[PDB]
């Protein structure tokens, strides 16, 4: 089913982001953002590549298939031949169309799941000092620079370095 | 998979609700509830209608299929004919039953996903002033009337109108 | 100072059918269906075909005298008839088991 991220609680995509599928947008003391997340997008590329190659290699190529000839006293066999060809053609066209239609919902839900998990990870490693504000943005009670940005990105945040100082600012706003 | 809402953290359904699939139940100063959510249920109706029409239009109708006749020296061709008919019949009955069995889990998980997303939306636009209490209910520290009920329903809540007053009552209970 | 989390967007216009929806605009896609062909008749693996022209298979094996051009041919990949191949049997009659001979001939 729909996991709720793409065109969900997160609004439309980012045109300005180029080198990936899933990324961040940061505004510390000296810049704006648009950096991609090269870890998760590589797993997505691997999954999709394996999927397409599997769908290609399940379908065998056909060899030579040439029509046959019958005279006017072999109408019965000729109708049988036509029945066999039309039956197999209907079966294969059904299989092809149905396979593509199911595979498309599978892949769109796969991307949706990736975005939701990439959001939950960032939320989980910023437990207290964040104050999420809407459509997947956070806001750092403490002060952050480029190093803590990369520290968030990699997945190594070390929360107890900042845990006291944030607390002060939180009690300032409350 | 199972998204966890229907017969999950939310208990059984509402018999008293009529005009939709997903709705609300409110108890402000002057009434009880059971109003439907006409936005999401319309998307569900559109999806299911397109699904059923797609499943109908993938199956081609058959034209005239009449049995054939053979004498006592054409047993070989007769067995071939019977083999062709039984083979195609087995293939089509397999495809029909398997298509229905997979489509049923797909549609039940689709409804389950819709209920979970409709819960997450209401939670997200009532960040501080709610105090959720169990099986998908909220409880408004501030005071609400019919206008803020519709304000929740449409998706236009304007939280900073109430954000201070709620805070007072919250500190009363703590 | 913030982090926001989002996803890629583009200016692509290619559409994909799905079960719950029709004409979905996707960012990247791949085709799985061939349409294009030349108008030519080339040779399988570097061996030329054999074009009967205005001649039939019966006319070629019997040696119908108007099929005098293709008298020295002895190797091919496949046999091409046209819609004007009529020179088959000049003296009238009936080639017996003509179709079985055409089926034996498709393995030589």
């Amino acid at each position, epitope marked *: 089913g729909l996991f709720g991220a793409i065109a969900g609680f997160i609004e439309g995509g980012w*045109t*300005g982001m180029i080198d990936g599928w899933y990324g961040y*947008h940061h*505004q510390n*003391e*000296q*810049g*704006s*953002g648009y950096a991609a997340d090269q870890k998760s997008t590589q797993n997505a590329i691997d999954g999709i590549t394996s999927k397409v190659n599997s769908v290609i290699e399940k379908m065998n190529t056909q060899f030579t298939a040439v029509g046959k000839e019958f005279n006017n006293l072999e109408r019965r066999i000729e109708n049988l031949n036509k029945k066999v060809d039309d039956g197999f053609l209907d079966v294969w066209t059904y299989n092809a169309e149905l396979l593509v239609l199911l595979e498309n919902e599978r892949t769109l839900d796969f991307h949706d799941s990736n975005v939701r998990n990439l959001y939950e990870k960032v939320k989980s490693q910023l437990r207290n000092n964040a*104050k999420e*504000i809407g459509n997947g943005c956070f*806001e*750092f*009670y403490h002060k952050c620079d480029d190093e803590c940005m990369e520290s968030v990105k990699n997945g190594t945040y070390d929360y107890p370095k900042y845990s006291e100082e944030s607390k002060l*600012n939180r009690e300032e*706003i409350d | 998979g199972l998204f966890g809402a229907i017969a999950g953290f939310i208990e059984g359904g509402w018999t008293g609700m009529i005009d939709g699939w997903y709705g609300y139940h409110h108890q402000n100063e002057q009434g009880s509830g059971y109003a439907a959510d006409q936005k999401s249920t319309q998307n569900a109706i559109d999806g299911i209608t397109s699904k059923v029409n797609s499943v109908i239009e993938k199956m081609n109708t058959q034209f005239t299929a009449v049995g054939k006749e053979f004498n006592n020296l054409e047993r070989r061709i007769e067995n071939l004919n019977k083999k062709v008919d039984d083979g195609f019949l087995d293939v089509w009955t397999y495809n029909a039953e398997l298509l229905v069995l997979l489509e049923n889990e797909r549609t039940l998980d689709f409804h389950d996903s819709n209920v979970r997303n409709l819960y997450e939306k209401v939670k997200s636009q009532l960040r501080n002033n709610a105090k959720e209490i169990g099986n998908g209910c909220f409880e408004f520290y501030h005071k609400c009337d019919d206008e803020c009920m519709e304000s929740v329903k449409n998706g236009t809540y*304007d939280y*900073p*109108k109430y*954000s*201070e007053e709620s805070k007072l009552n919250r500190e009363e209970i703590d | *100072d*913030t982090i*926001c989390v989002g996803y890629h967007a583009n200016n692509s216009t290619d559409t994909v059918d799905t079960v719950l929806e029709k004409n979905v605009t996707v960012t990247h896609s791949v085709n799985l269906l061939e349409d294009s062909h030349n108008g030519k008749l080339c040779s399988l693996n570097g061996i030329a075909p054999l074009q009967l022209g205005k001649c039939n298979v019966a006319g070629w094996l019997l040696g119908n005298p108007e099929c005098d051009l293709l008298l020295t041919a002895n190797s091919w990949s496949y046999i091409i008839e046209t819609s004007n191949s009529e020179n088959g049997t000049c003296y009238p009659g009936e080639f017996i088991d003509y179709e079985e001979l055409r089926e034996q001939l498709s393995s030589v």
Partner: antibody
Amino acid sequence: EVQLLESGGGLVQPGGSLRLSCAASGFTFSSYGMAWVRQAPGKGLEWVSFISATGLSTYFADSVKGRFTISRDTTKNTLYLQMNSLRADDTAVYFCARMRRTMIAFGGNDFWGQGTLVTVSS
Amino acid sequence: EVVMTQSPATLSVSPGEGATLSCRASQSVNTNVAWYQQKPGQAPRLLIYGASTRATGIPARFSGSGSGTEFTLTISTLQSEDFAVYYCQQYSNWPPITFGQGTRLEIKR
């Protein structure tokens, strides 16, 4: 209707201090970022400072680091900018302006004040 | 710091004509450019944001165009009140928000 009134100008000795104030009326004040933009006499615009909607993010221009602070009060709906230890080249007309959106790409400043004058000389 | 530059410095024009104005960035902002006009002794006002979308309550003779590093403001007709000063602003990579340098607009006789 949205208007931004502002005050706190006047001639001040070099090395002094001010506290300009911009009072907003016509919108929900606690859901938009605000910015201060000055203009030297007979020159172009120049950005000075910015405070976010929640008040958790403050940014200043590079030339005015450490000498300026900014704060907001929700109850009075009032934006304050505190200036300390001025110079001769801070003589400008100061404007309080409103961010059009609440994202990072805010999309221009739709509403503006009317300008208070500040002269620093001896 | 993205540095903006306007061109030309001063455009003289006769009434009943159009005009074109160029703003050029040192780096590639995507579409995050806005324009403003300023009368003498007035507050600025928002004309055109996102380089395409005109602001609410703007007459339709104003037009904005461009992407990448070069942007263009175009005025179709004049009625002698549009002679003002024009500024361009990027908001792609702030802080610090950077404005242009202004191009005044004169009557030609």
